[PDB]
Design a protein around this ligand. Structure first.
Ligand SMILES: CCCCCCCCCCCCCCCCCC(=O)OC[C@H](COP(=O)(O)OCCN)OC(=O)CCCCCCCCCCCCCCCCC
Ligand code: SF4
Ligand code: SF4
Ligand code: SF4
Lengths: 70, 303, 209, 171, 74, 156, 90, 96, 176
């Protein structure tokens, strides 16, 4: 029966399962648990620029919360 | 890391296309009363491996060409289109977030029209030129339709990000407020991939082969984002990618399943059918999907 | 396999010369140099899809010339295999029409049923297709005991399967669109062009040999 | 791979215009205009370019050179490079070489102008609060303010349709 | 009548004509325009204080200005 | 001699790659074509052997000459033979085609398809029973298993 | 240049596939033309349509409805003109 | 009820003898239908007849290795049966 | 007697005409065809695993062209030339001689496998059942020289088996 076609679709679906999942893992690895920041407006990009400027490490993910206030 | 991202996209396409070819052979074998290929190893995964490496081995078409550079220049373009269409496709996180991606989809469909036409001119004697010319005609007559329909379904969501699309699919599937528009869209995807029930009756045959099947997987993934699917809780993307893969596979099996059982159309029936029936119906759905979001207080947050 | 030299105004026609004669084999000449019983299989294989009505017509030509009537069981068994042959030629002509019009799968459905029918020829004589088996003078070497019940089985299952063929096609919308408007035949055409059988059944006149 | 990538894509662009202004076979001409349109898309997207440069790509590299290649395929033969074509290609490369050499090692090159010769990071936005990609909202007019403009445009295209059917045997 | 012969065309005309008409009998179009107007892109710019006008409220809690309340209640 | 060892192993891989799929073209003149389509049928398979029945001449691995070759047929048959890639093999199927056959003593018949194209595999029968043809293609595959081209190239 | 990196990688790997596939083994009708021109003109009218989903958030909604219906209506009149007047017949 | 299948569907896997035994006839050519053990034969080869399959899958041979001596673990020919088994295997009878 | 087709009209009643319109605009019996095809998907297909399982036959197949011989006895053929007198492509070639004993026998008994259409006539014409169409049909011969049988090849092929031939004949020597 079609128990013998499910290996074919099984392996090919695993071949389609992989790229988004491994890509999302590389997204999370490229900013250390963060998600890569999307960028569609000038507003978001300027906020990202001041964020990567204030961080000191010139990197927009360290996210520098509440421990440089005073 | 970014070149690792690119190679993790365009390494599994060979796996996907080869195993899609054995899957179409198997599924037709069971729509028909056959089994196999299963003498080539267990169930035949080495069967696409074997015929792929055979077609590489087998001695090429001797030229017999006109402008060697043009003749190499057509299929290189076809395959690099089939690669460069999977960049803005989010399963949950796309490779490149864009301001607009669906117009990029349609643009690369038109470059596929270029592939067909260049291979047809640089091909051969005159009869294949007439055949490829009819093929370009019946391909280009549907990019009116599919662009129209894609426009009228994104007008429900107003923006072009496609991640706003995966947001706005969260409550209902988008098949419910647009079923006839989605139906006609799916028929136009059968037109663009140029399969049965639509006629086309080369070198290198592997490259045209590859572009065909990657075009099919392209349109299926784009459908599966576009009209159905489910939610995505963040910090768990295996969940959405699983449901995405399963729905796209069911749709591609349905695609080949529709291919299995219908005879090919007469050509003037195809053009006649497109113009006189899909074109006024598309205009009807466009004018109603314009005038209805202005009715039901439902205009999207196009940020 | 034919040769077709057509002359067309564009995506339309004007004329067509069917160059036939690719498959000339000299059958009449070879029968003029042989005997009757020896040269029966040439009559078996000039047509090949229908395959036992050719036998039947040659055997009736000789029996009618020779003024000898076969025994009645021979006549009824010959009628049975004429019906199997009629069934077989129409089912293959429908399926090759479907395969060449497109339509991959019903070809293979009905060819599995035809594979049962070639098993029946095998059990009758032994040959797959070109069983001679109909001598002038009636049928030779009658059936082995245990065949008629198999034909009974085939009748039941095949009625079910052909109703499933009309389930698939026939109110197929686009196959109807594909072949309705083409192929008109006037009754004067069906007489003057010398048509035979199914064309006469199809265009007007009630007619059966 | 550096700052003057806008200027370099412009070099390839004008090379493409020379590449089909040398008058080859018109299917090579369709090739030259496709390559030139691709790098023009690159230039305007470097100014960003967010919609209109992706919009031209569908029309010319999506719906116009298709029909030019179609008409090359159905009308003209070109059944077989030459002196004059490639000689003009050589002199066009020479003229661009001369102009860009004088832009490089001097101040400015003047046809009758003063082209202030350096690459263009000037000028650009000073990081403003755009928030809607001003191209997009600009073209998201024409349906409030654009009463007259789109009406005469669509009317012209309708008249184009009836014109085409008349010359190709109206009715 | 001709619904038997060319049916998808008559269906297309029907949905076309109702799409033409239907904003005339519509109790929601004013709601659509209020929604669409009441969403600000630019900065809500203030103004120089007073000819002592009983408008333009000072603390943003004050409901003397034009606010929205049909938003929260659908 | 692991150089020779790599030669033999790679030759096994490429020749198994050739003999694995082997999609044919069915030339199919007469009733031998009907029996070939009966080995295309659901009972005697061809998917199992990677064998895709296909009317394409441009990509033809083997070519199943079956039916009855005639004098009017022959130049068009060899023109079909020419536009074909050079790794190619021929199965002469049928008593008509592999030696003239029942129409041997006749005009307008080339006495077997030996006199046009070379033949690797003869398979007789009238028609060759579909089972027997499938056996003939299996012994074609074993001929492909013994071909030693890369052996000859390395020690050439 | 990030999508130019992607385009470069796809283009180079495609050229590697093709050239390693190649080092290794060794009249006309008017009816063809009218459909293409009808494509072209309806595609340009598509180009005039397609900034529609940009425009639907303004303070002039009735007018936008009216001229959008005018664009699709004019496109429909062109369609029905060549439809009735033997433009696509055989 | 799919748990009722793979419980039974493993009974032709381990009832063969093991998993490398299952791999034997799987990669040999095709079959996993083992379970009847009807009759072996000199020059090695064994003959399995099961009733619950249809007519065309009753009687199947399992070839052995080097009966004439030509490494016929792989590349199994036809006609590697003795003639009385060439009567039984071709469905000309109902008794072995 | 005749039972013809296509004699109706599309019914003008509102239910039937809107049903044909619903099929026109809703793609229905196309999906009915999809349902029938998926029903054939969910059957088990009928293939035979060829190199192991062999497709069924009759006791009266016509194959190998084998010879027979007497019980512990000599060659069954008298060389009575009937098979070459009937052979409808004349592929038999018999040249006969007596030997030193006195019983009339042969010299040259050749079957062309090319011309042999596999009738059965030479089986039926044989008075002593000398030539018998054999049971197995696997010839698959790589060279055209090798498809031309000699009498010694036929005797070896009649002595690679009689038991099949004897069982087939001893079952069905009663029909013919
Ligand atoms: C092609 C294409 O569509 O590229 C889009 C991208 C511009 O991005 P877009 O989505 O338009 O919005 C800006 C925020 N990414 O365009 C780009 O990023 C273009 C970058 C310039 C280099 C590529 C030039 C191509 C030739
Ligand atoms: S050998 Fe027999 S089956 Fe084949 S073409 Fe000749 S007559 Fe037909
Ligand atoms: S008919 Fe029989 S005995 Fe007579 S010559 Fe022929 S094979 Fe021999
Ligand atoms: S089967 Fe027919 S062709 Fe063959 S040897 Fe006998 S009589 Fe001659």
């Amino acid at each position: 029966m079609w128990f013998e076609v499910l290996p074919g679709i099984a392996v090919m679906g695993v071949c389609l399962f992989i790229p988004g999942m491994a890509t999302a893992r590389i997204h999370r690895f490229s900013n250390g648990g963060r998600e890569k920041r999307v960028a569609h407006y000038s507003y978001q990009w300027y906020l990202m620029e001041r964020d990567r400027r204030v961080s000191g490490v010139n990197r927009y993910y360290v996210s520098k919360g509440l421990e440089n206030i005073d | 890391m970014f070149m690792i991202n690119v190679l993790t996209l365009i390494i599994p396409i060979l796996l996907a296309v080869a195993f899609l070819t054995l899957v179409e052979r198997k599924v037709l074998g069971y729509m028909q009363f056959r089994k196999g290929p299963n003498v080539v190893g267990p169930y035949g995964l080495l069967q696409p491996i074997a015929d792929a490496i055979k077609l590489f081995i087998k001695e090429p078409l001797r030229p017999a060409t006109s402008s060697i550079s043009m003749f190499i220049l057509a299929p290189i373009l076809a395959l690099t289109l089939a690669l460069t269409m999977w960049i803005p496709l989010p399963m949950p996180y796309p490779l490149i977030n864009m301001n607009l991606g669906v117009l990029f989809m349609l643009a690369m469909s038109s470059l596929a029209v270029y592939s067909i036409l260049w291979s047809g001119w640089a091909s051969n004697s005159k009869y294949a030129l007439i055949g490829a010319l009819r093929a370009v005609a019946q391909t280009i007559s549907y990019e009116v339709t599919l662009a129209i329909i894609l426009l009228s379904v994104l007008l429900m969501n107003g923006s072009f990000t496609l991640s706003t699309l995966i947001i706005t699919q969260e409550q209902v599937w988008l098949i419910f407020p647009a079923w006839p528009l989605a139906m006609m869209w799916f028929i136009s995807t059968l037109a663009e991939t140029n399969r049965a029930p639509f006629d086309l009756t080369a070198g290198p045959f592997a490259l045209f082969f590859m572009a065909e099947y990657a075009n099919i997987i392209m349109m299926n993934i784009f459908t599966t984002t576009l009209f159905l699917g489910a939610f995505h809780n963040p910090y768990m993307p295996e969940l959405y990618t699983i449901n995405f893969t399963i729905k796209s596979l069911l749709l591609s099996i349905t695609f080949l399943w529709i291919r299995a059982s219908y005879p090919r159309f007469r050509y003037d029936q195809l053009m006649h059918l497109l113009w006189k029936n899909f074109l006024p119906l598309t205009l009807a759905l466009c004018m109603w999907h314009v005038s209805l979001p202005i009715l039901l207080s439902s205009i999207p947050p196009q940020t | 396999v034919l040769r077709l030299v057509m002359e067309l105004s564009g995506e339309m026609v004007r004329k067509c010369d069917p160059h036939i004669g690719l498959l000339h084999r000299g059958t009449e000449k070879l029968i003029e140099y042989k005997t009757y019983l020896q040269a029966l299989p040439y009559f078996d294989r000039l047509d090949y899809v229908s395959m036992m009505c050719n036998e039947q017509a040659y055997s009736l030509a000789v029996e009618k010339l020779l003024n000898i009537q076969p025994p009645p069981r021979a006549q009824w068994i010959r009628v049975l295999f004429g019906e199997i042959t009629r069934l077989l030629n129409h089912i293959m002509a429908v399926t090759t029409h479907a395969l060449d019009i497109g339509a991959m799968t019903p070809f293979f459905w009905m060819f599995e049923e035809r594979e049962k029918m070639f098993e029946f020829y095998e059990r009758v004589s032994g040959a797959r297709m070109h069983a001679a088996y109909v001598r002038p003078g009636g049928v030779h070497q009658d059936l082995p005991l245990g065949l008629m019940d198999d034909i009974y089985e085939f009748s039941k299952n095949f009625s079910l399967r052909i109703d499933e063929l009309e389930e698939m096609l026939t109110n197929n919308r686009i196959w109807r669109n594909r072949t309705v408007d083409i192929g008109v035949v006037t009754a004067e055409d069906a007489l003057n062009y010398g048509f035979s059988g199914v064309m006469l059944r199809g265009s007007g006149i009630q007619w059966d040999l | 791979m550096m700052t003057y990538i806008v200027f370099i894509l412009s070099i390839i662009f004008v090379m493409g215009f020379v590449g089909f202004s040398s008058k080859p076979s018109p299917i090579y001409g369709g090739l030259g205009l496709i390559v030139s349109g691709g790098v023009g898309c690159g230039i305007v997207l470097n100014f960003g370019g967010s919609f209109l440069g992706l919009m031209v790509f569908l029309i010319y590299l999506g719906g116009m050179m298709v029909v030019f290649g179609y008409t090359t395929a159905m009308a003209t033969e070109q059944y077989p490079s030459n002196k004059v074509v490639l000689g003009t290609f050589i002199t066009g490369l020479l003229m661009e070489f001369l102009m860009v050499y004088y832009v490089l090692k001097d101040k400015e090159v003047e046809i009758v102008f003063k082209f202030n010769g350096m690459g263009d990071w000037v000028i650009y936005d000073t990081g403003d609060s755009g928030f809607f990609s001003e191209e997009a909202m600009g073209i998201a007019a024409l349906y409030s303010y654009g009463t007259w403009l789109v009406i005469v445009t669509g009317w012209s295209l309708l008249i184009g349709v009836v014109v085409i059917m008349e010359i190709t045997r109206g009715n | 009548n001709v619904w038997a012969k060319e049916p998808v065309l008559v269906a297309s005309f029907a949905i076309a004509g109702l799409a033409v008409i239907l904003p005339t009998l519509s109790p929601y179009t004013k709601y659509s325009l209020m929604i669409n107007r009441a969403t600000p892109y630019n900065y809500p710019v203030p103004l120089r204080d007073d000819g002592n006008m009983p408008d333009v409220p000072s603390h943003p809690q004050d409901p003397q200005g034009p606010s929205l309340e049909w938003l929260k209640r659908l | 001699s692991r150089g020779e060892y790599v030669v033999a192993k790679l030759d096994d891989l490429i020749n198994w790659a050739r003999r694995s799929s082997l999609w044919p073209m069915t030339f199919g003149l007469a009733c031998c074509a009907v029996e070939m389509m009966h080995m295309a049928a659901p009972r005697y398979d061809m998917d199992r052997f990677g064998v895709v029945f296909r009317a394409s001449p441009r990509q033809s691995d083997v070519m199943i000459v079956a039916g009855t070759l005639t004098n009017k047929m022959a130049p068009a048959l060899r023109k079909v033979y020419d536009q074909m890639p050079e790794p190619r093999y021929v199965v002469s199927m049928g008593s008509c085609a592999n030696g003239g056959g029942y129409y041997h003593y006749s005009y307008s018949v080339v006495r077997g398809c030996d006199r046009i194209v070379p033949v690797d595999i003869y398979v007789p029968g009238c028609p060759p029973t579909a089972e027997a043809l499938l056996y003939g293609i299996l012994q074609l595959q074993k001929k492909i298993k013994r071909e030693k081209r890369l052996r000859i190239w390395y020690r050439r | 240049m990030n999508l130019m990196i992607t385009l470069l990688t796809n283009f180079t790997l495609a050229t590697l596939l093709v050239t390693i596939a190649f080092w290794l083994p060794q009249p006309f009708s008017m009816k063809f033309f009218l459909v293409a021109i009808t494509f072209l003109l309806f595609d340009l009218e598509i180009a005039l349509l397609l900034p529609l989903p940009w425009a639907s958030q303004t303070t002039n909604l009735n007018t936008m409805l009216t001229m959008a219906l005018l664009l699709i209506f004019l496109l429909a009149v062109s369609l029905a003109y060549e439809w009735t007047q033997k433009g696509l017949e055989w | 009820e799919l748990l009722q299948v793979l419980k039974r569907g493993l009974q032709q896997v381990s009832g063969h003898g093991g998993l490398r035994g299952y791999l034997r006839v799987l990669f040999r050519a095709n079959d996993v239908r083992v379970g009847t053990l009807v009759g072996e034969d000199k020059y090695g080869n064994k003959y399995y007849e099961d009733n619950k399959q249809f007519f065309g899958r009753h009687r199947w041979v399992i070839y052995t290795t080097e009966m004439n001596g030509k490494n016929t673990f792989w590349d199994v020919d036809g006609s590697m049966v003795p003639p009385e088994w060439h009567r039984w295997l071709h469905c000309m009878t109902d008794d072995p | 007697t005749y039972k013809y087709v296509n004699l109706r009209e599309p019914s003008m009643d509102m239910k039937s005409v809107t049903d044909r319109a619903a099929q026109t605009l809703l793609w229905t019996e196309l999906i009915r065809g999809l349902g029938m095809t998926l029903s054939y998907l969910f059957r088990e297909p009928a293939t035979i695993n060829y190199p192991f399982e062999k497709g069924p036959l009759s006791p009266r197949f016509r194959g190998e062209h084998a010879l027979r011989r007497y019980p512990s006895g000599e060659e069954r053929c008298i060389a009575c030339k009937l098979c070459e007198a009937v052979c409808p492509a004349q592929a038999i070639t018999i040249e006969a001689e007596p030997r030193a004993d006195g019983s009339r026998r042969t010299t040259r008994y050749d079957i062309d496998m090319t011309k042999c259409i596999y009738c059965g006539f030479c089986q039926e014409a044989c008075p002593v059942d000398a030539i018998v169409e054999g049971p197995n049909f696997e010839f698959s011969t790589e060279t055209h020289e090798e498809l031309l049988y000699n009498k010694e090849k036929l005797l070896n092929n009649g002595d690679k088996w009689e038991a099949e031939i004897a069982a087939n004949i001893q079952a069905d020597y009663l029909y013919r």
